[PDB]
Amino acid sequence: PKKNKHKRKKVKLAVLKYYKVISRLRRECPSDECGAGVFMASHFDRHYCGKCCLTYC
Amino acid sequence: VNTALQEVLKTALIHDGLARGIREAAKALDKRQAHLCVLASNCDEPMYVKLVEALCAEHQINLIKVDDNKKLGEWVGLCKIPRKVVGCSCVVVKDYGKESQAKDVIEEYFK
Numbered sequence: 001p002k003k004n005k006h007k008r009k010k011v012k013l014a015v016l017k018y019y020k021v022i023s024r025l026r027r028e029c030p031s032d033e034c035g036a037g038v039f040m041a042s043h044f045d046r047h048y049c050g051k052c053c054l055t056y057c
Numbered sequence: 058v059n060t061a062l063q064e065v066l067k068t069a070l071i072h073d074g075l076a077r078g079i080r081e082a083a084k085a086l087d088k089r090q091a092h093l094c095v096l097a098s099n100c101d102e103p104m105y106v107k108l109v110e111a112l113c114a115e116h117q118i119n120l121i122k123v124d125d126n127k128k129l130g131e132w133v134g135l136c137k138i139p140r141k142v143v144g145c146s147c148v149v150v151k152d153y154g155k156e157s158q159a160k161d162v163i164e165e166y167f168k
């Protein structure tokens with residue numbers, strides 16, 4: 001066999017999936033190096049923001 | 058007259074003053090640091106993007122309109138002059154230089 005390389009996965013136009021139209025569709029990351037628009041990805045038993053590498057619950 | 062896009066954008070890229078792109082426009086609108094907003098009116102049909110249209114009514118931003126994507130992508134950003142075609146759809150200008158002819162035409166466009 002062979003070890004495969006990693007390709008950048010493509011979700012298509014998730015830029016409106018950060019909002020819900022006023023009202024956002026995902027929850028905010030508390031930070032001082034991030035903030036003013038930076039949200040956390042809400043997975044099924046955890047909540048994830050990229051830069052701080054923060055898990056909630 | 059179109060020196061309200063020629064004399065501000067070409068003199069604005071030299072000063073770390075452009076926020077080009079769409080999600081960076083959303084993070085810049087949540088920063089409350091949008092001063093100049095060049096929209097698109099070129100789309101598959103324009104009803105698919107309503108977020109930058111409605112977050113200024115929450116956030117009190119100036120809006121100047123254009124009708125073109127390819128002349129927008131020739132206004133701002135990079136291109137070959139078999140040619141590198143990229144197209145920009147929404148521009149947040151964050152900062153400026155110091156201008157004495159073109160402060161007003163981006164300033165006074167509040168109709």
Ligand SMILES: [Zn+2]
Pocket residue numbers: 029030031034049050051052053054
């Ligand atoms: Zn974080």
